[PDB]
Amino acid sequence: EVQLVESGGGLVQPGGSLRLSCAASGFTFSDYGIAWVRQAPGKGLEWVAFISDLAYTIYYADTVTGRFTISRDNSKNTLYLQMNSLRAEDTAVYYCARDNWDAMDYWGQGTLVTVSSASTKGPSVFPLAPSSKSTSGGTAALGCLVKDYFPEPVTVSWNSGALTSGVHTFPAVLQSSGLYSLSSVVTVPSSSLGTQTYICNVNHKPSNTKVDKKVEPKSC
Amino acid sequence: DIQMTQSPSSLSASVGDRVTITCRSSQSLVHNNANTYLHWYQQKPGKAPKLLIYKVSNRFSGVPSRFSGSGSGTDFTLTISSLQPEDFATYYCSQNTLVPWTFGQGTKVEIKRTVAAPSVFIFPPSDEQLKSGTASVVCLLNNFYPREAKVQWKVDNALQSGNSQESVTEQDSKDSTYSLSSTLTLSKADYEKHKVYACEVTHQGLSSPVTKSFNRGEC
């Protein structure tokens, strides 16, 4: 029931600014200190800022000091991190974590900040239809191609979350064009093909692209 | 300023094995209040870290009893008493006694598993992608172990080199396997001037390389 929800992340030009927001819920917010911790893609955890209980003490990481400002509004149950003069070195999933007074015990799911001069692009969604040349069998595979978006992240589900078994959503690959592309694949019984619908639910929030793609067999 | 060094940075262990992860401080983590703020985190793929152990040895709410902590001053330890498939993750120690608060590098735990051959599927480009002018031919290697595999692309016996990308899934939390998609990307112009699209896969669980192929045409 304890939750911290980060928002306000996104794409920013280098030198630009963002204000991250963390909406607290399910505890006494005014009782606890709140930390920010960031994780650059494929990298370790880096602590960045702390605001105490009533804001009396505030800590920054040297890497961040002067540019980032941590603040809170106890009456709003919200924490803020104002990030100025963003370098590429700041690209990271930024976590807000509540501190026990001994440990950061509850973290939010994170908001991704991408510092880049590239521009947002929505993806195209294409079906990966079951069986090539030879039809039928015992276990089939189908999927969706989510092609050519920037930046991360993209979300993929199947049948609005009702289908999870056999699902592999692959990490995105950065193509030579500076655009991302992934596949989400599912294995299902062959006998089920044509007696059930398979929809992939694609969301790319940064570009307001939200697409439901039906995937089925064809003629050849 | 406290440097947190973990040992090892990664490891493979079988299910049921005892696994020990070491954390080293450059400075005592005993606070002035006599407490020692060393904590351990588990981070699974694309999820936030979860608190496992706080203050050296305290198991956090809902943490299974096979996870424990140990140590004093400079040298600390995380033990997994009997490793389970869901225990795949990166583990981090952290200190809270001094500012800045610091983490170790992480120790990635992989689950060692019996060899499993991939299931190989090939997908021609949909007509709809074709209309946008591109062709992606996808090759899926499903539920295999170990992670290493080679995928070779051929178009009418012409070797394809550098025009294909691969993505591997993180180890599955239930059956401990990996999956891999290789995407061959062509112009639709090029795609339509050729017939046989073949994916050749090499893997330890495969006696002999397996080729999945199709013959072009919305036929």
Binding site: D31, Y32, G33, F50, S52, D53, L54, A55, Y56, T57, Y59, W101, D102 | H31, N32, N33, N35, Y37, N96, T97, L98, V99, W101
Partner: peptide, 10 residues
């Protein structure tokens, strides 16, 4: 150097 490990309430 040492971090505050008690709330601003104290």
């Amino acid at each position: 150097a040492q971090s505050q490990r008690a709330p601003d309430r104290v």
